[PDB]
Design a protein around this ligand. Structure first.
Ligand SMILES: *[C@@H]1O[C@H](CO)[C@@H](O[C@@H]2O[C@H](CO)[C@@H](O[C@@H]3O[C@H](CO)[C@@H](O)[C@H](O)[C@@H]3O)[C@H](O)[C@H]2NC(C)=O)[C@H](O)[C@H]1NC(C)=O
Ligand SMILES: *[C@@H]1O[C@H](CO)[C@@H](O[C@@H]2O[C@H](CO)[C@@H](O[C@@H]3O[C@H](CO)[C@@H](O)[C@H](O)[C@@H]3O)[C@H](O)[C@H]2NC(C)=O)[C@H](O)[C@H]1NC(C)=O
Ligand SMILES: *[C@@H]1O[C@H](CO[C@@H]2O[C@H](CO)[C@@H](O[C@@H]3O[C@H](CO)[C@@H](O)[C@H](O)[C@@H]3O)[C@H](O)[C@H]2NC(C)=O)[C@@H](O)[C@H](O)[C@H]1NC(C)=O
Ligand code: NAG
Ligand code: NAG
Lengths: 176, 274
């Protein structure tokens, strides 16, 4: 069982990160700095905890001269496609040992957004803590005010709860 | 076709302050020519400000795709700070899950002749008000009537408040058919304070019978706090000059007043109601 290290930035376009190391330890901190004329969006001071992800939002340097904005270049994932106009798509993929979770390709929408979720580089040991899972489930399912689940007027919703009877646990009638 | 939301009156002989297309699903916008945004699920705010010697005259926002909802049920566009007649306003518009794009054009006119008397009056104001709607009367007493096709609100008894195309409108109190329109007055931004009054002639053929007020005001919320407009004293035949004071919870930006005169009027108008 190997010591917990932290994914190295496969690239940080239009800026720099301080410091640069072949591998990052636990609780190591990086300062993300932008070049001139590029505005930062995300966490600059980022330290990555025992979960394996850096604290805060991904740091992006943007110039703001397109239809949609820079989707960011997450840590360990490298971006192909510098065109941010409409109908333009970018590709994301991970380095050795990392698996991509998100959108393999994001296409700029006519609303001004990208079609899909922000990709990330994940490993086998990494797990999502229950608290952020609940937060994301609430954010996706509900609308913050408190919170509420709105629907179309004079309309209802349907839920399809699907379980797996695989030969892994399947014990005592789905205990829990 | 698109959903067109209007603040003020369009003029064909003027120029536009700027024109930009905004992706409402972008987070955040693109700062075009140096103007800031604030975009949320339920709100879109443009902190526009111009560097020219001119005053804003109108604002028009076109939302796509077109969604079949009446625009007179509630209010969508409003300049939170400033407004029409100023050089800058914090323009707030509330979005929907279907609207994904917007196209904002803003018009300004030279600050020298910064007046709106030439566009809110029309050809014949006798039958048609500023809203462009015809006047309707009742034969019970030969007086005016009420309209129920726009956004209205009430606070106290016999209080009239109308909101259409960014215009806030009130009538004090009622108008007869035989009355003849005399003239109108305007109030500029430089003459506007927290509290102010007016003086009007009330002699010979200039006997005051009915007044109407149209204005542009700011909001601190989606639901506005209407100004407390009340008449002071009695506009009787003895006092030659009648006056009216205004008390404002929120600062006004523009004010227009129309004067209706009838020598045969008794100076008081109120229905047989309690
Ligand atoms: C980040 O963490 C690593 C590992 O925790 C630090 O490496 C330090 O030096 C060696 C080189 O890998 C580590 O390995 C061990 O060193 C002993 C000598 O004490 C040697 O017999 C073996 O090579 C053994 O594997 C060592 O654990 C580690 N030092 C300490 C105190 O744990 C590295 O310095 C950390 N910082 C950076 C910027 O990399
Ligand atoms: C969605 O985003 C919009 C902005 O795009 C949020 O509207 C803004 O909400 C803040 C806080 O509720 C308002 O600030 C207020 O400022 C006054 C100034 O004195 C202060 O007294 C209040 O206590 C409050 O802090 C701000 O005015 C408001 N802007 C507009 C244009 O309405 C909205 O709250 C967001 N909705 C969320 C996060 O659910
Ligand atoms: C035309 O004027 C009407 C009278 O003016 C108001 O009332 C008095 C006079 O009746 C004015 O002077 C006051 O007189 C008091 C004695 O009765 C003094 O004690 C007092 O200090 C003051 O000098 C007064 O200034 C004036 N205003 C008010 C608020 O009282 C008025 O009744 C009519 O409404 C007005 N016509 C209009 C406004 O159309
Ligand atoms: C980031 O951290 C460094 C030291 O850890 C600090 O000097 C700097 O001000 C921080 N940047 C911020 C808070 O934006
Ligand atoms: C699981 O359920 C079946 C029938 O529903 C029952 O026969 C069995 O005893 C249950 N297992 C338990 C209680 O551990």
């Amino acid at each position: 069982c190997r010591a917990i290290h932290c994914p190295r930035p496969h690239d940080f376009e239009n800026g720099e990160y301080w410091p640069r190391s072949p591998y990052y330890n636990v609780s190591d901190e990086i300062s993300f700095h932008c070049y001139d004329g590029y505005t930062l969006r995300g966490s600059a001071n980022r330290t990555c905890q025992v979960n394996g992800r850096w604290s805060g939002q991904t740091a992006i340097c943007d110039n703001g001269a397109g239809y949609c904005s820079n989707p960011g270049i997450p840590i360990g994932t490298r971006k192909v496609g510098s065109q941010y106009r409409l109908e333009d798509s970018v590709t994301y993929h991970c380095s050795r040992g990392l698996t991509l979770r998100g959108s393999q390709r994001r296409t700029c929408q006519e609303g001004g957004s990208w079609s899909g979720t922000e990709p990330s580089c994940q490993d086998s040991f990494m797990y999502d803590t229950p608290q952020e899972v609940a937060e994301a489930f609430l954010s996706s399912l509900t609308e913050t005010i408190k919170r509420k689940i709105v629907l179309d007027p004079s309309g209802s919703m349907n839920i399809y709860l699907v379980l797996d009877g695989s030969d892994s646990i399947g014990a005592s009638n789905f205990t829990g | 076709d698109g959903d067109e939301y209007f603040i003020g009156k369009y003029k064909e002989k003027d120029e536009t302050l700027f024109f930009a297309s905004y992706g409402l699903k972008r987070d955040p916008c693109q700062i075009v020519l140096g103007y800031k945004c604030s975009n949320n699920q339920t709100h879109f705010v443009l902190n526009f400000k111009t560097n020219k010697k001119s005053c804003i005259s109108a604002i028009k926002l076109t939302s796509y795709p077109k969604i079949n909802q009446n625009s007179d049920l509630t209010r969508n566009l409003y300049c939170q700070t400033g407004g029409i007649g100023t050089d800058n306003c914090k323009l707030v518009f509330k979005k929907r899950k279907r609207q994904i794009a917007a196209n904002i054009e803003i018009y300004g006119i030279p600050a020298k002749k910064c007046s709106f008397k030439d566009r809110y009056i029309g050809a014949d104001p006798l039958h048609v008000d500023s809203y462009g709607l015809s006047y309707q009367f009742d034969q019970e007493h030969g007086w005016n009537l009420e309209r129920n096709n726009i956004f209205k609100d009430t606070r106290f008894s016999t209080e009239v408040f109308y909101h259409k195309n960014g215009l806030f409108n009130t009538q004090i109190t009622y108008l007869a058919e035989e009355d003849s329109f005399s003239e109108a007055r305007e109030i500029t931004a430089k003459d506007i304070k927290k509290k102010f009054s007016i003086i009007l002639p009330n002699e010979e053929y200039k006997r005051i019978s009915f007044l109407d007020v149209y204005w542009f005001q700011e909001t601190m919320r989606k639901k506005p706090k209407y100004p407390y407009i009340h008449y002071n004293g009695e506009c009787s035949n003895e006092n030659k000059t009648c006056e009216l004071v205004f008390d404002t919870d929120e600062l006004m930006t523009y004010a227009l007043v129309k004067v209706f005169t009838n020598p045969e009027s008794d100076g008081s108008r109120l229905k047989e109601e309690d």
